[PDB]
Design a protein around this ligand. Structure first.
Ligand SMILES: COC1=C(OC)C(=O)C(C/C=C(\C)CC/C=C(\C)CC/C=C(\C)CC/C=C(\C)CC/C=C(\C)CC/C=C(\C)CC/C=C(\C)CC/C=C(\C)CC/C=C(\C)CCC=C(C)C)=C(C)C1=O
Ligand SMILES: CCCCCCCCCCCCCCCCCC(=O)OC[C@H](COP(=O)([O-])OCC[N+](C)(C)C)OC(=O)CCCCCCCCCCCCCCCCC
Ligand SMILES: CCCCCCCCCCCCCCCCCC(=O)OC[C@H](COP(=O)([O-])OCC[N+](C)(C)C)OC(=O)CCCCCCCCCCCCCCCCC
Ligand SMILES: CCCCCCCCCCCCCCCCCC(=O)OC[C@H](COP(=O)([O-])OCC[N+](C)(C)C)OC(=O)CCCCCCCCCCCCCCCCC
Lengths: 39, 99, 70, 53, 90, 65, 104, 488, 323, 71, 99, 192
């Protein structure tokens, strides 16, 4: 956790890009099957 | 007539790359350029054949050939750079150490 | 350079005390807060009055103890 | 100056391509005769085969 | 097509105006550049592949989306290689 | 030939290709599908039709002469 | 944009047809489907030209009937569908005026 | 993992392992926390482990590789022929990785990218062996070609390595252009790219005639590209220079691995698809040239690497006689010859890497080896005699079965040329054996001992070569089954 | 016919706009810096561009004699061609396009790709090696930031199914794409700032600094043509920004009082705001070192652009929000 | 929805346009067949518009120009 | 996108299901499949540790070997379970369970 | 006619590439022949393929060649050979290839001799005209994903090779660090 915070401080742009890409991959991996099941 | 003209142009470009390789004895970058001209002729042939035959395989494989040609050009210019740095010159007589 | 590396690690630990602070720093570096503030000051001076003297008709102030032409 | 030479070579290439169009038209015209020549040769081979058999 | 003839005529007129502008007064080593170019080739190929994918997202299904994601992951590992090796630095 | 046409529709003679392929799959001898192979190649290159049109043009021109 | 020949005849055109698309598809869906079926069965134009002739008869009769039913509204609709190249979003008032006279 | 991808578990695992190894190697070689460790040995051991694991996957999942037949039919088709070819390719790759470990530490070649490229090229050859289309064929060929460009030019400051990389670059690009033109001609004159479609269109009609002239040219150009890939004399001029210039592990991998993959590709594109007597005539001429000029040029060579390159060219010529007969026995003989040649080449290059410790360059360097390293002298002499074709050893089995396929072939001219070449080319192997055993040079080059990684592999390969004549039934049956399963 | 008339009516007003754009840059920068720009050549300096152009025309030319006379002369011609033909496609309202190409986005990307050749040849053909090095640096910077620009174009192309700018705007009808993608618009703005060598990332204009530039050797009209190409590219990419992230010829809130404005006025107004932002950023910020800007382009904007491409694709694919 | 409206309007109009085009092509092809017969009547062993294909499956005449519809 | 699961060679054993789901195949893991996974992971970890001693990264080497071995062993166990469940392998126990 | 002009220009540009004394001029004429091929693609109807030829061939590969050629600074008489000697062999090989082109054309592709009025327009596929870009994307990403993922491996190999061949980090050069304390917090200090 401490190392993660240090890395986010030192390199904020790569952390932001990683979070955005993780969200973009997470929407169709989980939310898309959830919506398909709901429909 | 259009197919005849396109095929003739592509074959002429292929022969012109062959001629570039033939004439450029002490020139090696132009040999690579003639190889790239051969690649361009191949791509043009694939595209015109796809158009004439109403099949999409030619376009797919022309795109893949473009990607491969770009990658091989990158690698080839890397080899050229490292060779020129090693021997300080691009002359052919300095690249004849193996026989 | 080992001293520099350990100083960098100590500073990173110091300025990463909690998630609130790290998130604030990351957002400030990502959303260009200082750039926006500089732009706002620049816009204020764009909209403020000018100090150009309009040379041939308006001339700069002088003093009686001025050293001009002998 | 090389621009004039480049344009002269362009005109020469244009003339060469009209010559290529001419030879293409010539091949289009003289195809049937090649067809009967090939048919006659194939008939000769077939007759030779049937005489061997 | 039928729309690139205006482009050709525009190119000709641009040549004419540029030549006129030129003729108006007459009336009176380093490996970093190579590495940057190679990265340019790779990412031009990337964008060239993105264009049809982006246009045809509506037809290609999650299969196509995940194929493109796998392509990126294969090529993003190369970008991590670039970053850690030091090719992006100057 | 794959059926993927150049404009997103059925290929020009993917139907001819499939007729030839079905003949080859259900045939007793490969020469049985000679006619269908000729049809597929003729669609691919228009050789026979172009030759017929060329000889018609030749007769028309020589009649003019 | 005229939509009418000299002697009151309706010019097929494309603006007129695009204006009367819904009316055509509602009146004679039937032989339109039949002509499409014949085209699928045999792509040769000569094999079944009668279905095409019936479709043409339907379209011409509908165009004549629509023109003789409402003229000003249909003329304005065709004119505005010729000014903008068959773009329905750019012709809404004229389309609505056409709808009120000749109901679907 | 959805159930179609049962057909591609070996390739997927090898790709993911290559990615993991690349990431690990970069992140722990660019690390200032350690002393920038040389990760070549660790990455090589992990890559050998990955090769073994994917070999186990491919071997155990023999019927599962056929899952999703129609789904994968566009790209590749897997059967017993491809299964055995991939098994042999993985074994050869594992042997090459294992026997090149000592080169790393002693010669300071500490670029793990070499192992990464080994794995990536091995995946490319897997895709090639499975490939069943004119597009996957080209993609896999180009992937291994780029990998081998980087491999040959790996030593940046080495003049020999740079020159070999440049030559192999230019000539491979030329061959790729020729093969691409052939593919374009076939596509334009056929309308087809899948091998099944090409077979359906081409069977029943000879390629020598007024019709299908474009098809004939496309097939000929593809054959030219493939012949360049196997170093036939009309297109062999790259093989000796790059084999000498490139680092010894690189040239060993080049001599061992690509041969089987390219030849399986040739069998699947030519014997199945475009089977016609003109292709066998082309390969007959190529085999005649390959054998004759390989023997003639290797007689005049005085360097170990160049002699090995020319021996490889000659043995490719023998594989080409096996192909140019193109029957059931011909294809079985081709496979037997490929297996035996791969084993013998692994043996020879393991011995060469063993002698690389003291930087052996010339044939005379290994002189008086019968005194300093007796058992090594006998082992290398056994390998040289196997290359000759002396009966008790493994090479003679492939030799006489190739000649038997040629006698049942009807190619009496081809068999006579091959046997005359076999007699002619024995001289330089005999000269090697003389240098080890017979000569008494004024000064001796003492050779340092081996590593266990090379020693175990060399012992196993020498035992297999020497004692193969006691039990060749498994290999003969496997190759016969592969040849039969090529079609049905 | 009418096509040459349309082409001339696009080209000549573009040159007038470029002249008044450099005048407006002077005026805005001066007003920022508590001074007044050109005010003595005509009323409010409106005749200053005319006077400058006339002086440049009347200045007697000089021939460097660099043994590369053709390549030396034709490079500014090449960049001027590229700027104009790039402007040949940009729409201004519903139906104000010369070539309504279905691949308009990729056409503009290709034209931007071709733009480096003028500067590269200008640097090489010059006798001095400093100009060659500066041209190489500028070319590499434009390369990196054009990669970023292409990724942003891919994001927009994910948002809108079509590839032509007119249908892009017709899709922009709803939300202007700037409300959903303001960070993407910001990154595209910075990337186009670095693409035209304007604002920060200003290597060639740092002539007083050691980097010098590729225009040192060029004579009056060569320098003038390079300047015209750069400023035409500036206007072009402002138009690209407003067509991609501000809806082009579309009003705000679709009120009927706002629809009285033709729409070409709307596009012009948005382009004017983007040009004002260009001059604002140039006047308000310092400049980056070459290595700093290259590392920023290859390490900050490329990963963010890829991440935004992935995020937009994931949002659109997951939900029925797809065209 | 707007694009679907436009395409639905296009589809309803298609049969009459296809009928008109079919009649036009039939007229032109009959004229061409008459021309071919009147110019080719002299040579023996010549058919009138014989199809070079087999098993029926009528196809439009080849134009000899690549992609004539786009222009 | 259409997908076909039909294999070229017919299974030699009774087929519980042609296309079993991923969760079902994972839940079919017998003690033998777990032994396969454990053995492969342990071999990989041991190889990583023994090879990473010379570079000096024992923890990192074991971690990399562990990821590689987990991937390979899970792939092998899934392969065996799926081959059994589709009738490609001697699936006596789950055939009896299905019956 | 426009087609004839275009490939006449392409042939002249290729000949200039072959026989150009200066490699920079060779690169420029290579750019010209790529542009002519793009124009031929416009004539064919492949707008996407023409644009990607521009972007990749004209942009990427050609700037790569230009950079490497200019950075080499190749002098004359270092790459220089008389072309008259190789003229006979070049002519013989070109004539053989041209004769083979002759034989290929004489059998398969027969040119058509003079048409427009006989064009049968289907009207069925024109209701929704699929663009070349659209069709290529649909196919390449749905049903040919393997031949699309494989070039990713090729690009990865190219990048790895380029780095392992042309990487040279500075052994002893100071690098600026922005993460210093005075940049981060900067507590004020005085002499007192
Ligand atoms: C920062 O420093 C610098 C400056 O300072 C601000 C400069 O000005 C410049 C030079 C900048 C210029 C804009 C000079 C060019 C001047 C122009 C006026 C551009 C040329 C424009 C034209 C030739 C178009 C005019 C054509 C007309 C009017 C024809 C009209 C036709 C019709 C009406 C229809 C037919 C009749 C530079 C390089 C510079 O670096
Ligand atoms: C109605 C008919 C009108 C006439 C039509 C024909 C006109 C003449 C066409 C031939 C070309 C004439 C000009 C050549 C100029 C060469 C200048 C030179 O040395 O350049 C140096 C360059 C080398 O570059 P360089 O770097 O040395 O450039 C120096 C340039 N100068 C000399 C101007 C300073 O040479 C070449 O590039 C080789 C050119 C070879 C010739 C190519 C001609 C074009 C293609 C012809 C195809 C066949 C045509 C005939 C077909 C007949 C039917 C089948
Ligand atoms: C689900 C998705 C949810 C998304 C929520 C929002 C997240 C946004 C994250 C990305 C922001 C992108 C825009 C900012 C950007 O590109 O910053 C990059 C970077 C921010 O990082 P940086 O590069 O400044 O950081 C210094 C360098 N490192 C990374 C080593 C510390 O911005 C710049 O570089 C600015 C360059 C100068 C710009 C001058 C023009 C300014 C014009 C006015 C702007 C207002
Ligand atoms: C159970 C079967 C495998 C047993 C492996 C035993 C250890 C082998 C590695 C080793 O220690 O080599 C020592 C040798 C020599 O090490 P050394 O020379 O440092 O040891 C002697 C040290 N002094 C001189 C201080 C006393 O190291 C190597 O060969 C290099 C590392 C090889 C790593 C091999 C890993 C995989 C092994 C097979 C796994 C299956």
């Amino acid at each position: 956790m401490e190392k993660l915070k240090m890395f986010v401080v030192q390199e904020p742009v790569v952390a932001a890009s990683c979070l955005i890409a993780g969200f973009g991959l997470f929407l169709p991996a989980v939310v898309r099957p959830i919506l398909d099941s709901y429909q | 007539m259009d197919l005849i003209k396109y095929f003739t142009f592509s074959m002429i470009i292929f022969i012109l790359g062959i001629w570039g390789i033939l004439l450029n004895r002490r020139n090696i970058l132009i040999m690579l350029m003639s190889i790239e001209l051969m690649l361009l002729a191949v791509n043009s042939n694939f595209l015109v054949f796809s158009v004439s035959l109403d099949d999409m395989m030619g376009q797919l494989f022309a795109l893949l050939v473009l990607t491969v040609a770009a990658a091989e050009s990158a690698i080839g210019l890397a080899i050229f750079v490292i060779t020129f740095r090693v021997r300080g010159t691009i002359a052919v007589e300095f690249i004849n150490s193996i026989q | 350079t080992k001293l520099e590396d350990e100083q960098r690690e100590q500073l990173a630990k110091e300025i990463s005390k909690d998630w609130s602070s790290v998130f604030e720093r990351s957002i400030n570096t990502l959303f260009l807060t200082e750039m926006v503030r500089g732009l706002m000051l620049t816009l204020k001076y764009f909209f403020e009055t000018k100090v150009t003297i309009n040379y041939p008709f308006e001339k700069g102030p002088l003093s009686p103890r001025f050293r001009g032409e002998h | 100056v090389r621009v004039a030479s480049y344009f002269a070579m362009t005109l020469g290439a244009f003339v060469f391509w009209q010559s290529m169009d001419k030879v293409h038209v010539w091949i289009a015209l003289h195809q049937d005769e090649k067809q009967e020549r090939l048919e006659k040769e194939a008939e000769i081979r077939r007759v030779r085969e049937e005489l061997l058999k | 097509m039928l729309e690139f003839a205006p482009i050709c005529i525009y190119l000709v007129i641009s040549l004419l105006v540029s030549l006129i502008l030129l003729g108006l007064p007459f009336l009176f080593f380093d490996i970093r550049f190579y590495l940057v170019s190679i990265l340019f080739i790779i990412f031009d190929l990337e964008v060239t592949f993105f264009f049809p994918w982006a246009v045809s997202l509506n037809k290609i299904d999650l299969f196509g989306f995940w194929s493109m994601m796998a392509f990126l992951l294969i090529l993003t590992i190369g970008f991590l290689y670039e970053w850690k090796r030091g090719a992006l630095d100057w | 030939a794959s059926g993927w046409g150049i404009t997103g529709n059925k290929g020009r003679c993917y139907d001819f290709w499939m007729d030839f392929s079905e003949c080859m799959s259900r045939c007793r001898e490969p020469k049985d599908c000679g006619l269908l192979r000729e049809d597929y190649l003729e669609c691919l290159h228009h050789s026979k039709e172009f030759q017929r049109r060329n000889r018609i043009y030749k007769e028309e021109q020589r009649k003019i002469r | 944009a005229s939509a009418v020949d000299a002697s009151g005849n309706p010019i097929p055109s494309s603006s007129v047809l695009m204006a009367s698309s819904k009316h055509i598809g509602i009146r004679c869906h039937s032989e339109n489907l039949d002509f499409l079926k014949c085209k699928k069965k045999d792509p040769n134009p000569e094999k079944c030209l009668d279905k095409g002739r019936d479709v043409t008869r339907c379209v011409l009769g509908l165009l004549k009937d629509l023109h003789q039913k409402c003229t000003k509204e249909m003329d304005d609709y065709v004119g505005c569908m010729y000014y903008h190249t068959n773009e329905f979003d750019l012709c809404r008032k004229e389309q609505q005026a056409f709808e009120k006279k000749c109901s679907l | 993992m959805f159930n179609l991808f049962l057909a591609v578990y070996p390739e997927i695992f090898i790709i993911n392992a290559t990615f993991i190894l690349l990431i690990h190697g970069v992140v722990f070689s660019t690390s200032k926390k350690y002393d920038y460790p040389p990760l070549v040995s660790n990455v090589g051991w992990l890559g050998l482990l990955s090769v073994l694991i994917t070999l186990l996957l491919l071997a155990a999942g023999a019927p599962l590789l056929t899952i999703a037949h129609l789904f994968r039919n566009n790209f590749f088709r897997r059967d017993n022929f491809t299964y055995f070819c991939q098994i042999l390719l993985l074994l050869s790759t594992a042997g090459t990785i294992s026997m090149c470990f000592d080169f790393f530490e002693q010669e300071r070649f500490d670029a793990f990218e070499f192992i990464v490229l080994i794995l990536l090229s091995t995946c490319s050859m897997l895709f090639m062996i499975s490939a069943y289309d004119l597009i996957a064929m080209y993609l896999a060929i180009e992937l291994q070609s780029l990998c081998f460009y980087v491999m040959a030019a790996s030593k940046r400051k080495s003049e020999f390595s740079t020159e070999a990389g440049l030559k192999y670059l230019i000539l491979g690009a030329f061959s790729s252009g020729i093969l691409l033109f052939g593919c374009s001609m076939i596509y334009g004159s056929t309308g087809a790219t899948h091998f099944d479609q090409l077979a359906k269109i081409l069977t029943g009609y000879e390629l020598a005639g007024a019709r299908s002239s474009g098809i004939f040219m496309g097939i000929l150009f593809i054959a030219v590209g493939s012949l360049f890939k196997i170093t036939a004399v009309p297109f062999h001029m790259w093989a000796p220079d790059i084999y000498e210039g490139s680092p010894t592990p690189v040239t060993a991998f080049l001599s061992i691995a690509p041969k089987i993959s390219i030849f399986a590709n040739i069998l699947r594109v030519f014997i199945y698809g475009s089977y016609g007597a003109t292709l066998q005539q082309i390969f007959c001429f190529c085999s005649i040239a390959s054998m004759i000029l390989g023997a003639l040029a290797a007689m005049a060579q005085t360097k170990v690497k160049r002699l090995l390159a020319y021996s490889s060219i000659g043995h490719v010529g023998y594989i080409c006689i096996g192909f140019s007969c193109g029957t059931i026995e011909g294809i079985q003989s081709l496979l037997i010859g490929i297996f035996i040649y791969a084993l013998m080449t692994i043996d020879a290059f393991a011995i060469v890497l063993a002698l690389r410790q003291t930087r052996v360059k010339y044939i005379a360097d290994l002189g008086a080896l019968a005194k300093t390293n007796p058992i090594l002298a006998i082992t290398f002499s056994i390998t040289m005699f196997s290359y000759v074709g002396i009966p008790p050893l493994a090479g003679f089995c492939s030799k006489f079965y190739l000649f038997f396929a040629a006698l049942g072939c009807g190619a009496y001219f081809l068999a006579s040329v091959g046997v005359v070449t076999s007699v002619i080319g024995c001289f330089y192997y005999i000269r090697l054996v003389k240098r080890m055993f017979f000569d008494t040079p004024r000064t001796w080059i003492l050779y340092e001992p081996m590593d266990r990684d090379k020693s175990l592999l060399l012992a196993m390969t020498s035992s297999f070569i020497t004692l193969f004549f006691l039990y060749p039934s498994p290999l003969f049956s496997v190759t016969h089954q592969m040849a039969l399963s090529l079609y049905l | 016919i009418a096509v040459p008339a349309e082409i001339l009516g696009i080209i000549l007003p573009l040159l007038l706009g470029v002249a008044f754009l450099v005048l407006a840059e002077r005026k805005v920068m001066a007003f920022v810096q508590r001074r007044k720009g050109p005010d003595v050549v005509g009323s409010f300096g409106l005749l200053q561009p005319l006077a400058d152009g006339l002086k440049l025309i009347l200045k007697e030319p000089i021939s460097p004699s660099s043994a590369n006379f053709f390549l030396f002369r034709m490079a500014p011609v090449a960049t001027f061609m590229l700027s104009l033909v790039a402007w040949a496609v940009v729409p201004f309202d519903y139906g104000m396009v010369l070539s309504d190409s279905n691949i308009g986005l990729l056409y503009l990307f290709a034209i931007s790709s071709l733009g480096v050749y003028g500067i590269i040849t200008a640097g090489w053909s010059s006798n001095s090696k400093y100009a060659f090095l500066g041209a190489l640096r500028s070319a590499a910077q434009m390369v990196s930031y054009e990669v970023s620009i292409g990724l942003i174009l891919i994001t927009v192309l994910i948002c809108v199914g079509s590839c032509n700018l007119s249908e892009i705007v017709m899709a922009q009808k709803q939300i202007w794409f700037g409300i959903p993608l303001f960070p993407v618009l910001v990154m595209f703005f910075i990337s186009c700032l670095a693409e035209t060598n304007r604002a920060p990332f200003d290597l060639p204009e740092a002539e007083a600094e050691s980097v010098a530039g590729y225009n040192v050797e060029y004579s009056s009209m060569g320098f003038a043509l390079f300047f015209l190409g750069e400023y035409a590219n500036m206007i072009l990419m402002s138009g690209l920004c407003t067509s991609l992230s501000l809806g082009g010829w579309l009003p705000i809130l679709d009120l009927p009082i706002f629809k009285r404005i033709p729409g070409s006025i709307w596009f012009s107004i948005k382009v004017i705001l983007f040009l004002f932002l260009y001059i604002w950023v140039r006047a308000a910020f310092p400049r980056y070192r070459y290595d700093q800007l290259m590392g920023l382009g290859w390490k900050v904007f490329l990963p963010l652009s890829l991440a935004w491409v992935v995020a937009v694709s994931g949002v659109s694919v997951t939900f029925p929000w797809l065209p | 929805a707007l694009k679907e409206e436009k395409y639905a309007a296009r589809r309803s109009i298609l049969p009459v346009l296809q009928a008109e085009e079919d009649e036009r092509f039939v007229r032109e092809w009959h004229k061409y067949l008459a021309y071919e017969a009147e110019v080719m009547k002299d040579v023996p062993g010549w058919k009138v518009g014989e199809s070079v294909y087999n098993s029926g499956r009528w196809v439009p005449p080849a134009s000899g120009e690549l992609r004539p519809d786009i222009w | 996108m259409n997908t076909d699961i039909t294999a070229s060679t017919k299974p030699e054993y009774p087929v519980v299901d042609r296309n079993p789901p991923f969760t079902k195949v994972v839940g079919n893991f017998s003690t033998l499949d777990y032994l396969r996974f454990v053995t492969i992971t342990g071999v990989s970890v041991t190889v990583g540790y023994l090879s990473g001693i010379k570079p000096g990264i024992r923890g990192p080497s074991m971690v990399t070997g562990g990821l590689i071995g987990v991937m390979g062993g899970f792939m092998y166990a899934y392969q065996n379970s799926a081959g059994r469940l589709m009738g490609f392998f001697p699936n006596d126990d789950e055939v009896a369970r299905h019956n | 006619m426009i087609l004839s002009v275009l490939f006449s220009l392409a042939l002249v540009s290729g000949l200039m590439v072959v026989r150009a004394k200066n490699p920079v001029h060779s690169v420029l004429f290579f750019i010209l022949v790529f542009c002519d091929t793009s124009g031929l693609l416009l004539l064919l109807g492949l707008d996407f393929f023409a644009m990607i030829f521009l972007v990749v061939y004209i942009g990427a590969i050609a700037v790569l060649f230009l950079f490497v050629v200019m950075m080499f600074h190749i002098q004359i008489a270092e790459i220089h050979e008389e072309v008259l000697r190789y003229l006979p062999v070049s002519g013989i090989i070109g004539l053989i290839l041209w004769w083979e082109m002759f034989f290929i054309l004489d059998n398969e592709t027969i040119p058509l001799l003079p048409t427009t009025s006989l064009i049968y327009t289907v009207y069925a596929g024109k209701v929704r005209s699929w663009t070349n870009l659209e069709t290529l994307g649909n196919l390449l990403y749905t049903y040919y994903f393997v031949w699309f993922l494989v070039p990713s491996l090729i690009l990865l190999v190219a990048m790895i090779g380029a780095i392992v061949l042309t990487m040279h980090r500075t052994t002893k050069v100071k690098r600026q660090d922005v993460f210093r304390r005075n940049a981060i917090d900067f507590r004020r200090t005085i002499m007192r």
